[PDB]
Design an enzyme around this catalytic site. Structure first.
Site, PDB file in Angstrom:
ATOM      1  N   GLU A 101       7.439   3.255  17.751  1.00 25.03           N
ATOM      2  CA  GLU A 101       7.561   4.111  16.559  1.00 25.03           C
ATOM      3  C   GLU A 101       8.619   5.196  16.747  1.00 25.03           C
ATOM      4  O   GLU A 101       9.329   5.548  15.815  1.00 25.03           O
ATOM      5  CB  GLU A 101       6.220   4.770  16.210  1.00 25.03           C
ATOM      6  N   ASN A 112      11.519   7.368   4.245  1.00 26.69           N
ATOM      7  CA  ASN A 112      11.164   6.092   3.612  1.00 26.69           C
ATOM      8  C   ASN A 112      11.688   6.018   2.185  1.00 26.69           C
ATOM      9  O   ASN A 112      12.004   7.043   1.583  1.00 26.69           O
ATOM     10  CB  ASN A 112       9.646   5.870   3.626  1.00 26.69           C
ATOM     11  N   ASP A 117      10.378   5.482  -0.689  1.00 25.95           N
ATOM     12  CA  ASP A 117       9.597   6.182  -1.702  1.00 25.95           C
ATOM     13  C   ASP A 117       9.727   7.706  -1.620  1.00 25.95           C
ATOM     14  O   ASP A 117       9.025   8.432  -2.327  1.00 25.95           O
ATOM     15  CB  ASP A 117       8.123   5.776  -1.593  1.00 25.95           C
ATOM     16  N   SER A 143       8.889   9.632   0.940  1.00 25.56           N
ATOM     17  CA  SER A 143       8.085  10.213   2.008  1.00 25.56           C
ATOM     18  C   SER A 143       8.872  10.167   3.339  1.00 25.56           C
ATOM     19  O   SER A 143       9.929   9.554   3.434  1.00 25.56           O
ATOM     20  CB  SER A 143       6.739   9.495   2.130  1.00 25.56           C
ATOM     21  N   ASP A 148       8.362   9.990   7.809  1.00 30.74           N
ATOM     22  CA  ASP A 148       7.496   9.824   8.978  1.00 30.74           C
ATOM     23  C   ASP A 148       7.876  10.804  10.095  1.00 30.74           C
ATOM     24  O   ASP A 148       9.046  11.034  10.338  1.00 30.74           O
ATOM     25  CB  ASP A 148       7.596   8.398   9.513  1.00 30.74           C
ATOM     26  N   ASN A 154       3.022   9.701   8.324  1.00 27.36           N
ATOM     27  CA  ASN A 154       3.707   9.682   7.046  1.00 27.36           C
ATOM     28  C   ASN A 154       3.251  10.797   6.077  1.00 27.36           C
ATOM     29  O   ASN A 154       2.057  11.084   5.953  1.00 27.36           O
ATOM     30  CB  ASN A 154       3.513   8.294   6.436  1.00 27.36           C
ATOM     31  N   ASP A 214      -9.782   5.236   9.341  1.00 28.18           N
ATOM     32  CA  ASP A 214      -9.868   5.174   7.887  1.00 28.18           C
ATOM     33  C   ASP A 214     -10.135   3.773   7.350  1.00 28.18           C
ATOM     34  O   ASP A 214     -10.066   3.550   6.143  1.00 28.18           O
ATOM     35  CB  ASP A 214      -8.586   5.759   7.261  1.00 28.18           C
TER      36      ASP A 214
END
Ligand SMILES: [Cl-]
Ligand SMILES: [Cl-]
Ligand code: NA
Length: 129
Positions: A35, A46, A48, A50, A52, A59, A101
């Site tokens: 990562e 990203n 959209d 957003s 990271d 994110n 989650d």
């Protein structure tokens, strides 16, 4: 800070990641490797809008606030900048919430694509833990 392989392993172990929700330490080190290349300061934008952040590339759409991701949540209740610190505590604490989650470590696309189903224990081989 750019961590060494075994240095990071030890730090993650100390923060209670080893076998957290059934994921052995090698998984976490492998995910951090692909990562961020073990760099706490890594950022990536990203499509959209957003971004990271940090060693586990957490994110901003769901997990932290960076003040520039409209209609996003802040479920770890931290500024995303906190995730870039040389102290990995905030990154670790937030990761525990993510992995809990429902989707386990599949939340990290690089773990799914480059670690899942491999010999992940190799990532902590040779380390004094
Ligand atoms: Cl392991
Ligand atoms: Cl799971
Ligand atoms: Na956010």
């Amino acid at each position: 800070k750019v961590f060494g392989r075994c240095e990071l392993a030890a730090a993650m172990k100390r923060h209670g990641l080893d076998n957290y929700r059934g994921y052995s330490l090698g998984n976490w080190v492998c995910a951090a490797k692909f990562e961020s290349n073990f760099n706490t300061q890594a950022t990536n934008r990203n499509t959209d809008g957003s971004t990271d952040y940090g060693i586990l590339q957490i994110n901003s759409r769901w997990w932290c606030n960076d003040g520039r991701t409209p209609g996003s949540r802040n479920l770890c209740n931290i500024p995303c900048s906190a995730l870039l610190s040389s102290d990995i505590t905030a990154s670790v604490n937030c990761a525990k919430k993510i992995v809990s989650d429902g989707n386990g470590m599949n939340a990290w696309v690089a773990w799914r694509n480059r670690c899942k189903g491999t010999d992940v224990q190799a990532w902590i081989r040779g380390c004094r833990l």
